Amino acid sequence: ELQEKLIAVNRVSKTVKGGRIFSFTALTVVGDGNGRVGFGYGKAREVPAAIQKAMEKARRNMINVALNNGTLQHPVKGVHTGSRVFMQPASEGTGIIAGGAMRAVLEVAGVHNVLAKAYGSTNPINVVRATIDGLENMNSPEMVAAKR
């Protein structure tokens, strides 16, 4: 069934009036591997409490990547905040060559081969979004033909 992947976890600390309250954050990637992905980022006092809460949010917000022979349709360049992400399809026998933040989202996405890179800001939280955003702008011939 659905498969999860922990991108990264941050301690996170804020100076609240009365002392220091700690709240852990966590980036999770839920995906079956045949065309669906899900990014979640929830907070919690405990690490596991955030991990679980994150996976729940990731499964609530999923997208459908139109995979084609273990690859993507056309190249895309998503630009979230200061961060930037680019994607480019590649023939078989290539391998998911990209950042851990993107690869983890691509592996579960079902993508078998793809070339990518991060530009501008490289924030792990901003790159994942730019990644899922680019996976949305993705279109197929049937879509471009039907929508036209």
Partner RNA sequence: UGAAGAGUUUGAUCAUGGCUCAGAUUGAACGCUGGCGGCAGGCCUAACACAUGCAAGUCGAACGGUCCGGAAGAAGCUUUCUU
**86 binding RNA? (CB under 7 A):** yes
**23 binding RNA? (CB under 7 A):** no
Identify the DSSP state of 20: E
Q: CA-CA distances (angstroms) from residue 84 to 43, 110, 113, 128?
A: 24, 22, 20, 10
**91 binding RNA? (CB under 7 A):** yes
Binding mask 40-79 for RNA (x = CB under 7 A): ----------------------------------------
**98 binding RNA? (CB under 7 A):** yes
Given candidates 15, 19, 20, 142, which one binds RNA under the rule CB under 7 A?
15
Tell me the C-alpha distance between 102 and 135, whole Å.
11
Of the pair 95, 141, the CB lying nearest RNA is at 95
b/e sequence 105-119, b meaning 16+ C-beta within 10 Å: bbbbbbbbbbbbebe
Six-digit token string for 85 = 């992400």
Given candidates 25, 33, 117, 140, which one binds RNA under the rule CB under 7 A?
117
